[PDB]
Amino acid sequence: ADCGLRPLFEKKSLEDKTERELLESYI
Amino acid sequence: IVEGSDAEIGMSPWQVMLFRKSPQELLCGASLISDRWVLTAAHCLLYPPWDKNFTENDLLVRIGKHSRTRYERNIEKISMLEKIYIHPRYNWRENLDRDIALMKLKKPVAFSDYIHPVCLPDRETAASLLQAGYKGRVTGWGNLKETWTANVGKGQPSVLQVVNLPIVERPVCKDSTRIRITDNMFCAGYKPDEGKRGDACEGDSGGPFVMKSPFNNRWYQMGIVSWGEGCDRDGKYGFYTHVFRLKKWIQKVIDQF
Amino acid sequence: XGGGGNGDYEPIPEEAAX
Numbered sequence: 001a002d003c004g005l006r007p008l009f010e011k012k013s014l015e016d017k018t019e020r021e022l023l024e025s026y027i
Numbered sequence: 028i029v030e031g032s033d034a035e036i037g038m039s040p041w042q043v044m045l046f047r048k049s050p051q052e053l054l055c056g057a058s059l060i061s062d063r064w065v066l067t068a069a070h071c072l073l074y075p076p077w078d079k080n081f082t083e084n085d086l087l088v089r090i091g092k093h094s095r096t097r098y099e100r101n102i103e104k105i106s107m108l109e110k111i112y113i114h115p116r117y118n119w120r121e122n123l124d125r126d127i128a129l130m131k132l133k134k135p136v137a138f139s140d141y142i143h144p145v146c147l148p149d150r151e152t153a154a155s156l157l158q159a160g161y162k163g164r165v166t167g168w169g170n171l172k173e174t175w176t177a178n179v180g181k182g183q184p185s186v187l188q189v190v191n192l193p194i195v196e197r198p199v200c201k202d203s204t205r206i207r208i209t210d211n212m213f214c215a216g217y218k219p220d221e222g223k224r225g226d227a228c229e230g231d232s233g234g235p236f237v238m239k240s241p242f243n244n245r246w247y248q249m250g251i252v253s254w255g256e257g258c259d260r261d262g263k264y265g266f267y268t269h270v271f272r273l274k275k276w277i278q279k280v281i282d283q284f
Numbered sequence: 285x286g287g288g289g290n291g292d293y294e295p296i297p298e299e300a301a302x
Contacts, residue, residue, distance in 0.1 A: 003060075003146035004245030007139070008037035016038050018164075019239060021191050025162040026241050052290030087296075096293045098300070105300050134302055170287050183289055229287050255285060 028167050029259040030225035031190035036093060039166045041145035041248070042187060044089040045071055045233060047081075054081075056167045056234025058248055059090060059144045062135035064281065067233035068251050068268060069117040069128040076119070083108035088132065091141040093187055095168040102141055109133045112280050114273065124209045126253045126268045129280055145237060145248045152247055153271035156238050159196040163215065163238045163249055164189060165265075169230030173258040183230070190225040192216050195264055203264055204256060211272050212253060214264035226265050228258035236267045 005011055043057035043065050055071035065088055072081045091103045110131045118124040136142060148156075166189045175182040192215045200214035208214075215236065217223050227234065236250030250267030257263060270277075 003144050004240075004247060005143075006037060006040055006246070007141075007143055008040075010244055016035050018032075018189070018191055022162045022164065022239055023241055025160060025193065026156070047290075050290050051293050051295075052288060053293070095289075098294050098296050105296065105302065107302060168289075174286070182287060229285060230289060257285065 028165065028169055028184070028188035028190050028225070028231055029171060029173070029228050031188040034093070034166060034187040034189045037141050038189065039187065040091070040141055040143040041235065041246075042092070042166055043067075044092055044168065046087045046089050048085060048087055053095070053168060053230055054086065055230070055232045056169070056252065057088065057130070058235040059136070059142065060147060060248070061144055062138070063132045065130040065132065066235075066248070066251065066277075067128050067130060068126045068253055069113045070119065070123060070126050070253070071233040072111060072128055073113055073117070074119055083111055088130065090136055091139065093141075095183065095185060095187070104136055104142060106132045106134065106136055114276060122207050122209065123254055124211050125273060126212075127251060127270075127273050127276075129277065145235060146245050147274060147277065148247045148249060148271045150271070152240055152242075153249065155242070156240065156247070157194060157213065157249060157271075160193055161238070162191045162193045163236045164191045165227050165231070165234065165236050165252060167227060167231030167234040167252065169232070170228040170258065173228065173260070190227075192225055192265070200264055200266070203262060208266075211269050212266050213250065213269055214266045215250075216264040219261040224259055226255060226259040227252045
């Protein structure tokens with residue numbers, strides 16, 4: 001329902017140090 | 028985790044530590060999928076060849092942790108198991124096919140900045156993201172190296188580790204091992220010539236392999252750390268239980284409706 | 285797949301069980 005949205009990250013619109021590495025690989 | 032890095036606080040709020048009551052020891056990783064359910068690998072609980080067969084009374088679940096050894100007062104939460112469910116067709120006899128198990132908590136856990144569930148994939152999310160080359164993320168308090176001299180330090184981290192790895196083409200997974208691979212597993216890691224490296228290791232078993240959907244920004248658990256030959260060896264890859272392929276079973280035992 | 289991790293963990297008070 002509220003799954004997969006982290007309180008300290010997605011919820012606050014903040015990114016962790018390496019998540020971009022994942023998104024850049026999706027294509 | 029080998030060749031990984033310190034995790035940030037609250038970076039993986041679904042991370043669960045499976046802890047043996049006595050002797051107090053770390054058994055495996057696990058993931059929180061709702062207020063009352065934890066997902067892990069069946070081999071963490073049952074593996075006859077080594078006489079491993081744990082019951083609910085044998086362990087505790089620790090949620091919201093960052094430090095491996097400390098009792099994070101006011102942050103981590105501890106839960107007891109009401110019941111364990113292992114896949115009826117878990118093949119411990121030959122290749123660990125269907126290496127999955129659900130654990131029902133005695134009481135619902137309360138969410139917080141450090142405790143929050145991960146999503147389970149729907150058919151389309153699995154379809155879009157489970158492709159060779161796409162990276163997922165693995166976390167755990169497991170060993171930092173395959174082997175290290177005793178008394179000379181510790182191959183154990185003091186804080187949760189994290190590593191991002193690419194999903195590998197099925198024929199490459201199959202040609203890297205003598206074990207018979209099934210559709211219920213996928214492998215991941217860098218190839219010898221890609222330069223970068225990293226892998227899960229002993230102690231990381233049962234932990235989550237997750238990916239972030241670029242469509243809705245949510246984190247989904249696509250796999251469970253299952254097995255691997257050594258840790259971070261060139262030419263070898265880590266294998267993971269394919270969560271989406273076993274989702275009907277998961278939904279079945281939950282009967283949430 | 286020598287480490288089991290059993291000995292350097294800090295005790296958990298009873299006031300934390302459920």
